[PDB]
Amino acid sequence: SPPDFCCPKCQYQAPDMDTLQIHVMECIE
Ligand SMILES: [Zn+2]
């Protein structure tokens, strides 16, 4: 099961899908 909870900005590992989206939404300055 290829990990899909990875951020395309810093490869950050998210515990879920929602939190992950929130991370990327601001991961960009
Ligand atoms: Zn990120």
UniProtKB/Swiss-Prot annotation:
Heart, brain, placenta, lung, liver, skeletal muscle, kidney and pancreas. Neddylated by TRIM40, resulting in stabilization of NFKBIA and down-regulation of NF-kappa-B activity. (Microbial infection) Cleaved by hepatitis A virus (HAV) protease 3C allowing the virus to disrupt the host innate immune signaling. It is linked to Ectodermal dysplasia and immunodeficiency 1: A form of ectoderma dysplasia, a heterogeneous group of disorders due to abnormal development of two or more ectodermal structures. EDAID1 is an X-linked recessive disorder characterized by absence of sweat glands, sparse scalp hair, rare conical teeth and immunological abnormalities resulting in severe infectious diseases. Severely affected individuals may also show lymphedema, osteopetrosis, and, rarely, hematologic abnormalities. The phenotype is highly variable, and may be fatal in childhood. Residues 2-29 are annotated as: Interaction with CYLD. It is found in: Cytoplasm; Nucleus. It comes from Homo sapiens (Human). A zinc finger (CCHC NOA-type) spans 2-29. This is NF-kappa-B essential modulator. Zn(2+) binds at C7, C10, H23, C27. Regulatory subunit of the IKK core complex which phosphorylates inhibitors of NF-kappa-B thus leading to the dissociation of the inhibitor/NF-kappa-B complex and ultimately the degradation of the inhibitor. Its binding to scaffolding polyubiquitin plays a key role in IKK activation by multiple signaling receptor pathways. Can recognize and bind both 'Lys-63'-linked and linear polyubiquitin upon cell stimulation, with a much higher affinity for linear polyubiquitin. Could be implicated in NF-kappa-B-mediated protection from cytokine toxicity. Essential for viral activation of IRF3. Homodimer; disulfide-linked. Component of the I-kappa-B-kinase (IKK) core complex consisting of CHUK, IKBKB and IKBKG; probably four alpha/CHUK-beta/IKBKB dimers are associated with four gamma/IKBKG subunits. The IKK core complex seems to associate with regulatory or adapter proteins to form a IKK-signalosome holo-complex. The IKK complex associates with TERF2IP/RAP1, leading to promote IKK-mediated phosphorylation of RELA/p65. Part of a complex composed of NCOA2, NCOA3, CHUK/IKKA, IKBKB, IKBKG and CREBBP. Interacts with COPS3, CYLD, NALP2, TRPC4AP and PIDD1. There is a cross-link at K9 (Glycyl lysine isopeptide (Lys-Gly) (interchain with G-Cter in ubiquitin)). The leucine-zipper domain and the CCHC NOA-type zinc-fingers constitute the UBAN region and are essential for polyubiquitin binding and for the activation of IRF3.
